[PDB]
């Protein structure tokens, strides 16, 4: 029947049942249990899934249980303190999408201030890591997407252009999120929050309008808008000092 | 950088061999094999395609990569020990149809002892249970989650997320189809076109892909209807093929 509507009180009842199950099963190996995501922020919608995190004392612990009841869905991640802290301090290309977890933790069980430590680690990441992540995103994603749509212009298929344009808009949102060091609230709010930030690359707002309105059938206009955004990227990185090394033909 | 420039396969292969000689110079007899994959590996590279290369190392626990651009072209070279690579080649994730075509597109450039053939044999010999498990996980981890997201959109917005969400659902449906038929899509651009040509699709998937491929994603009510129809098709299809776990308990551990 798919996911059903639930109240925040019903979801918190489920969360506390899962907390008791975790403590019953894993005992003294549990350091902390938290709720994150929309429920952690107390902004869960009628149909939201449930996301929980556990900090384990066991070295190298890294597993998860993710299931449905037919009516709702739960994901519980189990990590050692060291593994969780390392993950909280790594800035990947999709950091603005993934690390909102650490700014939305609602502690429900904690034997020693562990979840507060995780939050402090996540918020204290040095500026250089975002600089590195931005330069990596330009090479690994945006430059690659530019080749993809330039291939489409000369040989098709234009049937990929709507999906690719969605992917380019999301990559630009990651670029903006890394620059401003902000984690988007939900996947649904990524594009709306991205285009409200200051110092956007030129052409990004215009590109996102096609994506947000769903008007992705004019292939020529999309290709022109993608090229305009790609040009805006170049000027923007120059403005903010996100300079990619292009000097080495083989960098090893 | 003016972005990716037009190149011929001849020009791209010239770059590939320059990279090969550097790899052999630097790592020497620790290099067991070097291959090209992707579109260049398939001899179907387009004018603007990037370059992807793989290196099998003899070195214990070797696992690194170099990914760079010259401003005109972009290269990624992955270096893995044989055991690490073969383990990766036999692991089936939700995006297996998108990642593992690599192992069916190897163009051998250097090979000291049948290593690249071994990689290919490992990738093509994955047990059926791993695809069954990956499909059941994909249903929970992505499709069920997406259903909650678009039902939230129906009742509280934002509809500005619906075109992107519909694209993501179509892609997840393509992963489901690719796992079921054991097929790896050639390129990112051909995922949906290849997916809808497979047999025995969940009901509603063709209609959903029609919105995504045409780019006509502005009618939110039509998208929501199409998504629910595909979600109904998922229920019927997974049940008919046995991609079903017991969901009766609130906590299954
Ligand atoms: Ca790539
Ligand atoms: Ca790798
Ligand atoms: Ca999730």
From Swiss-Prot, chain A:
Enzyme class: transferase
Binding, Mg(2+) A: 49, 51, 144
Cofactor note text: Binds 1 or 2 Mg(2+) per subunit depending on the catalytic state, the liganding residues shift as catalysis proceeds.
Protein residues bound to kanamycin A: 66, 73, 75, 140, 144
Active site per UniProt: 144
Thermal properties: Thermostable at 50 degrees Celsius for about 14 minutes, at 55 degrees Celsius for about 2 minutes.
Binding site for ATP: 38, 41, 48-49, 51, 144, 148, 186
Cofactor section: Mg(2+)
C-terminal domain: annotated span: 127-240
Record note on quaternary structure: Homodimer.
Miscellaneous section: Although some of the cross-references in are mapped to other bacteria, they are probably all derived from the gene originally encoded on plasmid pUB110 in S.aureus.
Domain-level remarks: Bilobed; the N-terminus has a 5-strand beta-pleated sheet while the C-terminus is a helical bundle.
Protein name: Aminoglycoside nucleotidyltransferase (4')
């Amino acid at each position: 029947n798919g996911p059903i509507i639930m109240t925040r009180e019903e979801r918190m009842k489920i969360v506390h049942e899962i907390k008791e199950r975790i403590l019953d099963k894993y005992g003294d190996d549990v350091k902390a249990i938290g709720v994150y995501g929309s429920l952690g922020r107390q902004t869960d919608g009628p149909y939201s899934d449930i996301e929980m995190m556990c900090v384990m004392s066991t070295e190298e612990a890294e597993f998860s249980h993710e299931w449905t009841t037919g009516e709702w869905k739960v994901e519980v991640n189990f990590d050692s303190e060291e593994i969780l802290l390392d993950y909280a301090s790594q800035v990947e290309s999709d950091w603005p999408l993934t690390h909102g977890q650490f700014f939305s933790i609602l502690p429900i069980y904690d034997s020693g201030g562990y979840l507060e430590k995780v939050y402090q680690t996540a918020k204290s990441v040095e500026a250089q890591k975002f600089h590195d992540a931005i330069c990596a995103l330009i090479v690994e994603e945006l430059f690659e997407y530019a080749g993809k749509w330039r291939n489409i212009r000369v040989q098709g298929p234009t049937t990929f252009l709507p999906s690719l344009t969605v992917q380019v808009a999301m990559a630009g949102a990651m670029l903006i999120g890394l620059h401003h060091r902000i984690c988007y609230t939900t996947s649904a709010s990524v594009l709306t929050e991205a285009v409200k930030q200051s110092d956007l690359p030129s052409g990004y707002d215009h590109l996102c309008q096609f994506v947000m309105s769903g008007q992705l059938s004019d292939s020529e206009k999309l290709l022109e808008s993608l090229e305009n955004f790609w040009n805006g990227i170049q000027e923007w990185t120059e403005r903010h000092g996100y300079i990619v090394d292009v000097s080495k033909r083989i960098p090893f």
